[PDB]
């Protein structure tokens, strides 16, 4: 508890999981969730469904700090990224805005052999 009322909601989508982090206006985490926090284990953490659940778990836990509106900040490309956006919108929390800030290098480190034929 501290009472924030307005903050940030970071979505980190991956082809392996989705994990939501909610922070204060300065980017300090208040609460967080993920397909793992919810009961999911292996490959299902990446499911769009799980993302929904993780997103809702996050919102609710954020209501406890008495938060109402947030700025969604999406990072990554992964099955279940948009469900998280929707999950948040439909959860009391007011979504003042969505913004994609997935990091991309201006070609820096050689990728793993799995993600090559790129740089």
């Amino acid at each position: 508890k501290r009472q924030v009322a307005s903050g940030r909601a970071y979505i980190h989508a991956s082809y392996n999981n989705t994990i939501v982090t909610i922070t204060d206006p300065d980017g300090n985490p208040i609460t967080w969730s993920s397909g793992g926090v919810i009961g999911y284990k292996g490959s299902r953490k990446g499911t769009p469904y799980a993302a929904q659940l993780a997103a809702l778990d996050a919102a609710k836990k954020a209501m406890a700090y008495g938060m109402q509106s947030v700025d969604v900040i999406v990072r990554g490309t992964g099955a279940g990224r948009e469900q998280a956006i929707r999950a948040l919108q439909a959860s009391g929390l007011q979504v003042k805005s969505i913004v994609d800030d997935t990091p991309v290098p201006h070609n820096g480190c050689r990728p793993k052999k799995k993600f090559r034929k790129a740089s």
Binding site: Y40, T47, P48, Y49, A50, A79
Partner: protein
Amino acid sequence: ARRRRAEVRQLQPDLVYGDVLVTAFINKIMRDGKKNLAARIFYDACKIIQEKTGQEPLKVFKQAVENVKPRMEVRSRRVGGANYQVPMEVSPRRQQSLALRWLVQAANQRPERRAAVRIAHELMDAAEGKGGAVKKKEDVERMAEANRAYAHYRW
């Protein structure tokens, strides 16, 4: 059905309630094409729904069929690695086909010693939210929704 879309069959309405749905149920109760014996059964049982209920049998019948209709069911679908039980809406027609098939099935699982009694009691018990059929309908519905994680395999 590779070429066409397979149109549905039409059935002569009931020789009593003049209802098609009734005939459908009659046919599911049928066996070895003994439609006469089949018809009797539904009727006797249809009577037994009264003098046990002040209500009309048809209203009872039609509402049992209703509570047994599944709104979601899980179907298979291989997606490299194994088969994922995918949940999904059940078409208006399969609901009916399933509902009736299930009633006759649960009915015949009952202990009541004679047919008409069994269909009768299953009809009734179903009408108020209980009985073999409704159980099935709920195990199915529970199956779907229990696999929400594979909902994105729409189809």
